[PDB]
Amino acid sequence: KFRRSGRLVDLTNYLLTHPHELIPLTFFSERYESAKSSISEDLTIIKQTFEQQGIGTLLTVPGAAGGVKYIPKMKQAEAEEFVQTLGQSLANPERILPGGYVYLTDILGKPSVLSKVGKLFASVFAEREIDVVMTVATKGIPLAYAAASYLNVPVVIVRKDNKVTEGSTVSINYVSGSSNRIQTMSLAKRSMKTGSNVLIIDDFMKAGGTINGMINLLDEFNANVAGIGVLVEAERLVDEYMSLLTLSTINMKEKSIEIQNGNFLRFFKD
Amino acid sequence: KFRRSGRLVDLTNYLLTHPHELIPLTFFSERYESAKSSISEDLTIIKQTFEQQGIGTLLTVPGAAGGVKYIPKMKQAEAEEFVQTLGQSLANPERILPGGYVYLTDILGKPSVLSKVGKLFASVFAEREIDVVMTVATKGIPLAYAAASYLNVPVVIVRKDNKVTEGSTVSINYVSGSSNRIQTMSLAKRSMKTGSNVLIIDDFMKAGGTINGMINLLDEFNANVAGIGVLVEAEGRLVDEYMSLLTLSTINMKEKSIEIQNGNFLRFF
Numbered sequence: 418k419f420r421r422s423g424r425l426v427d428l429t430n431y432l433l434t435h436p437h438e439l440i441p442l443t444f445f446s447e448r449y450e451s452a453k454s455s456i457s458e459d460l461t462i463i464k465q466t467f468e469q470q471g472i473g474t475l476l477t478v479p480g481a482a483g484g485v486k487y488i489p490k491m492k493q494a495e496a497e498e499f500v501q502t503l504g505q506s507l508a509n510p511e512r513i514l515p516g517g518y519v520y521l522t523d524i525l526g527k528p529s530v531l532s533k534v535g536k537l538f539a540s541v542f543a544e545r546e547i548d549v550v551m552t553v554a555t556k557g558i559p560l561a562y563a564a565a566s567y568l569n570v571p572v573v574i575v576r577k578d579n580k581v582t583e584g585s586t587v588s589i590n591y592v593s594g595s596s597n598r599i600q601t602m603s604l605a606k607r608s609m610k611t612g613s614n615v616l617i618i619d620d621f622m623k624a625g626g627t628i629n630g631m632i633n634l635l636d637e638f639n640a641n642v643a644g645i646g647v648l649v650e651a652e653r654l655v656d657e658y659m660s661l662l663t664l665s666t667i668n669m670k671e672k673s674i675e676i677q678n679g680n681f682l683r684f685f686k687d
Numbered sequence: 688k689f690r691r692s693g694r695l696v697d698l699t700n701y702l703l704t705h706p707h708e709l710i711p712l713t714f715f716s717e718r719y720e721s722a723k724s725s726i727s728e729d730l731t732i733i734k735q736t737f738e739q740q741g742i743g744t745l746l747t748v749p750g751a752a753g754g755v756k757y758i759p760k761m762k763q764a765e766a767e768e769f770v771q772t773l774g775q776s777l778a779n780p781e782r783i784l785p786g787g788y789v790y791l792t793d794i795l796g797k798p799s800v801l802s803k804v805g806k807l808f809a810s811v812f813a814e815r816e817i818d819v820v821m822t823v824a825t826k827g828i829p830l831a832y833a834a835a836s837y838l839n840v841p842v843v844i845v846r847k848d849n850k851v852t853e854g855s856t857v858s859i860n861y862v863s864g865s866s867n868r869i870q871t872m873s874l875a876k877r878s879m880k881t882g883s884n885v886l887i888i889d890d891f892m893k894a895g896g897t898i899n900g901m902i903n904l905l906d907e908f909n910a911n912v913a914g915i916g917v918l919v920e921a922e923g924r925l926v927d928e929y930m931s932l933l934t935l936s937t938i939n940m941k942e943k944s945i946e947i948q949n950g951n952f953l954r955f956f
């Protein structure tokens with residue numbers, strides 16, 4: 418069957434792979450052929466270790482329709498050290514592109530980096546009620562999936578083309594600050610339940626025209642924005658958002674990227 | 688310092704979050720302030736439990752240059768049952784779209800499905816030399832990042848635009864079987880090192896002209912095809928060796944009927 422040593426390894430792996438799911442104690446008890454009191458002490462050790470190591474926390478919801486829920490969390494210390502390292506790598510002037518753009522797609526591709534950004538996002542929005550994570554194609558998509566895996570919620574991708582083949586669609590128009598052109602963004606009607614609570618994730622925000630377009634698109638679904646998370650904000654039509662980094666405009670002459678913290682610390686108060 | 692119980696929990700978490708990394712036994716000795724004799728006892732328990740529970744294999748390589756490595760693996764039974772499960776739910780007649788297309792957007796969006804498809808891909812290609820996972824925007828991107836996270840390699844996204852502003856780009860042309868139009872797919876030059884071993888991941892293959900486009904694009908970088916993996920292949924093929932989970936028989940738009948069976952994935956077990 419299972420001795421205690423293996424039971425803890427399996428318990429640890431089951432929790433880590435089912436974050437934000439409520440598991441009844443009888444599930445573990447029947448699985449390891451052990452008493453619910455022995456399971457509860459194993460969950461006490463996992464709890465203390467998760468907290469000490471900065472992995473997360475275990476919530477116990479009481480009652481027969483209760484159980485345990487693993488919640489990924491990030492300590493403020495690991496958060497600002499990681500954001501500091503991130504900003505230092507984004508500071509590289511080799512990333513400067515024509516038009517004052519910054520090359521970040523190597524960073525959005527590394528697995529270690531994405532899992533920590535996704536964990537950070539999930540840590541900050543852990544206690545909101547999120548049905549779905551939403552972003553717009555294309556570069557926001559890795560971030561959206563990292564965050565959604567820790568939160569255990571589907572991802573919805575807003576498309577800027579009505580090229581697509583995925584059934585009936587709803588589109589709106591929005592003004593970016595860029596092309597002050599009116600671009601269009603769209604979403605399949607069958608890809609989001611109406612009334613859902615949406616966490617919006619995106620790679621980058623300047624004055625927020627794209628995110629505000631996502632907000633108005635949610636109105637057409639009678640959905641609610643549970644939160645807004647952005648990796649980089651430029652130095653604003655939007656409301657409350659969390660940002661990891663702040664980018665001061667690229668001085669294209671001096672070849673200089675200057676980046677500081679975002680407002681993320683505001684969300685780590687003891 | 689940790690007692691044995693907290694050490695097992697931390698050790699499990701650390702291994703699960705650092706797959707395919709050779710970790711020296713001395714890293715854990717300094718970490719936990721304990722002998723390599725005690726840590727080797729814990730690795731032995733984790734190894735047995737990872738293997739019994741279908742989580743993966745814990746490979747111990749001796750020597751100073753060696754250590755411990757966690758390799759995500761899927762057992763055949765779990766692969767058979769998950770693929771059958773996925774196959775039936777995709778054979779839902781509501782998924783049929785105008786033009787004979789099949790709506791996958793919801794499946795490719797759920798986190799628990801993606802982690803098992805990603806783990807399946809990573810289990811089959813676990814022993815191959817891979818520097819990077821590559822896919823085409825947009826729907827392949829979830830599968831590619833799922834598989835890459837288990838393999839611990841970066842992800843590279845081929846754009847069917849050339850619009851994109853990420854520096855100097857290499858573009859090629861290719862013919863779909865669809866629009867027998869010649870479309871264009873591009874790849875930034877600073878997003879791929881010369882001679883990279885590339886695992887191609889996509890959501891759907893019919894004739895293979897998109898995947899064949901990606902292979903042609905890899906030669907402009909003198910990169911190699913480490914492997915090709917697709918969620919769904921259509922019946923009836925310019926491509927070489929690939930792995931598929933599902934096969935889709937053309938939607939009889941008259942009958943309202945999607946017919947789907949297993950792919951070729953069993954031949955890798």
Ligand SMILES: Nc1nc2c(ncn2[C@@H]2O[C@H](COP(=O)(O)OP(=O)(O)O)[C@@H](OP(=O)(O)OP(=O)(O)O)[C@H]2O)c(=O)[nH]1
Pocket residue numbers: 516517518519520521592593594595596621622623624625626627628651667
């Ligand atoms: N320097 C830099 N900019 C980025 C990066 N990623 C996105 N941007 C830009 O930020 C802006 C996104 O903000 P939006 O949500 O579109 O809101 P906005 O219309 O008010 O600008 C876009 O620039 P834009 O305002 O839409 O037009 P433009 O300034 O490029 O001419 C987008 O091109 C990056 O990595 N580095």
Ligand SMILES: Nc1nc2c(ncn2[C@@H]2O[C@H](COP(=O)(O)OP(=O)(O)O)[C@@H](OP(=O)(O)OP(=O)(O)O)[C@H]2O)c(=O)[nH]1
Pocket residue numbers: 787788789790791862863864865866891892893894895896897898899925938
């Ligand atoms: N039924 C269905 N088909 C999909 C779906 N997603 C992509 N396809 C089709 O699969 C094909 C992509 O495979 P390719 O790699 O391009 O293979 P190919 O060039 O030899 O045709 C495209 O059609 P095509 O092979 O170029 O021609 P056609 O069969 O669409 O007429 C594409 O339209 C889907 O979700 N459902």
